């Protein structure tokens, strides 16, 4: 087996027709296969110890059928939903966002390298944006070096005027990013993005080179920029914590009111529901509002360099419930839609009285993973995880 043979490449268990694709061979030392990371989306694969399989052709007819039917560039667009599958993942995405900002300037000896990395570059170093006092390029230029020539794209996000104060929206004219931060909504897997446009224009192979170009540029820059997470990324101030702890206190106090009404027969019965179902529904609405209200508070305090806001703001990994469950309240625990039932007779744990129905008596966790967990709350959390 030598360089540039087309081999079939497969992972079990294969589902949709994208899990069997023919790659080109490249001989390398050591004992493991190699993949470009952009093909981790149809395989449902990750490098945490998986295995895959390689099949080899033999005669010429089947090699022709592999190279002309089962290739990778001819599979970028999925017939399942009329939208692509392979996009930008992980560091390349986070740092392409960090690269295409409005306050990012590069000096010359670095631009020379960043331009010499691009395999499809021509040989015309573009003029800077600040000819004087000091030549300084930006990031949208050295990104626009990667995009081919003739592409047009126009996207409005939130209804912004063509002055762009929050740097949202997107305008690509002739392959030069005029304005717009490039993140997931553009170079991802969504319909109407960049990959779908170039795919439906300049051909499949050009779109098969775009990935390499962009990933090389962004990986070089981010290599010379660095990125890291710390424990201080998950620690809020003392101002918001008192606000959060108070919002829960009123929510908890509110609970005390609903229980009172239910015990003095002064509660409105909801249609189609017994008294106790309506009661349980009410409590849950109050507590879930509290968690969201508290979680929304912690999320908005955070400054403009809390790494987690960059990894979530880039849309690459995570979302709001993570910040909420690390900085505010862990919240509710569920078992089959209803809550921690009474295994013991008329009480949850033997550490509580009978007919006790305060928040923490039936699962409502009250802390955050930075502070800690009381034993009962830990037990209930383990129960929920076991359900999952």
């Amino acid at each position: 087996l030598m360089d540039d043979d087309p081999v079939l490449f497969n992972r079990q268990p294969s589902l949709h027709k994208m899990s069997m694709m023919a790659h080109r061979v490249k001989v390398m030392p050591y004992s493991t296969f190699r993949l470009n990371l952009s093909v981790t989306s149809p395989y449902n694969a990750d490098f945490d110890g998986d295995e895959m399989n390689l099949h080899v052709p033999q005669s010429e007819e089947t090699r022709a059928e592999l190279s002309q039917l089962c290739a990778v560039p001819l599979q970028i667009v999925s017939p399942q939903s009329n939208k692509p599958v392979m996009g930008i993942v992980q560091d390349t995405l986070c740092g392409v966002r960090k690269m295409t900002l409005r306050d990012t300037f590069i000096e010359y000896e670095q631009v020379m390298n960043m331009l010499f990395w691009v395999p499809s570059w021509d040989g015309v170093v573009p003029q800077p944006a600040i000819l004087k006092p000091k030549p300084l390029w930006t990031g949208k230029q050295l990104l626009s070096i990667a995009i081919p020539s003739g592409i047009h794209l126009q996207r409005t996000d939130g209804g912004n005027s063509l002055l762009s104060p929050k740097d949202n929206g997107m305008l690509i004219v002739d392959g030069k990013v005029m304005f717009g931060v490039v993140d997931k909504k553009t170079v991802g897997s969504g319909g109407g993005g960049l990959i779908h446009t170039v795919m439906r224009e300049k051909g499949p192979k050009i779109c098969a080179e775009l990935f390499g170009n962009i990933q090389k540029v962004v990986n070089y820059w981010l290599l010379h920029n660095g990125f890291s997470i710390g424990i201080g990324d998950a620690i809020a101030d003392a101002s918001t914590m008192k606000e959060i702890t108070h919002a829960i206190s009123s929510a908890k106090e509110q609970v005390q009111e609903i229980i009172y009404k239910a015990q003095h027969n002064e509660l409105e019965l909801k249609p189609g529901m017994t008294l106790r179902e309506s009661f349980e529904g009410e409590v849950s609405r109050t507590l879930n509002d509290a968690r969201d209200s508290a979680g929304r508070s912690a999320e908005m305090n955070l400054k403009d360099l809390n790494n987690v806001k960059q990894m979530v703001s880039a849309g690459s990994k995570g979302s709001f419930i993570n910040i909420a469950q690390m900085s505010a309240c862990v919240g509710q625990q569920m078992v089959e839609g209803k809550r921690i039932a009474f295994g013991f007779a008329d009480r949850s744990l033997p550490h509580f009285t009978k007919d006790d129905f305060s928040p923490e008596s039936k699962g409502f966790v009250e802390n955050s993973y930075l502070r800690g967990l009381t034993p009962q709350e830990f037990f209930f959390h383990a129960m929920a995880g076991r359900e999952g």
Partner: protein, 49 residues
């Protein structure tokens, strides 16, 4: 080890019951077919004679 089987799915003999406080471990358990079946006693447990 509890011999209830592997068929019939069901999520009642596999969950963690409330009366398992301190008599068995909550976290440690295998995965796959026998989740919740195989148990590992706590650190201060004992069997009568």
């Amino acid at each position: 080890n509890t011999p209830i089987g592997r068929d019939g799915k069901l999520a009642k003999p596999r969950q963690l019951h409330n009366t398992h406080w301190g008599l068995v471990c909550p976290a440690e358990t295998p995965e796959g077919q026998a989740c919740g079946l195989v148990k590992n006693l706590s650190l201060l447990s004992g069997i009568s004679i």
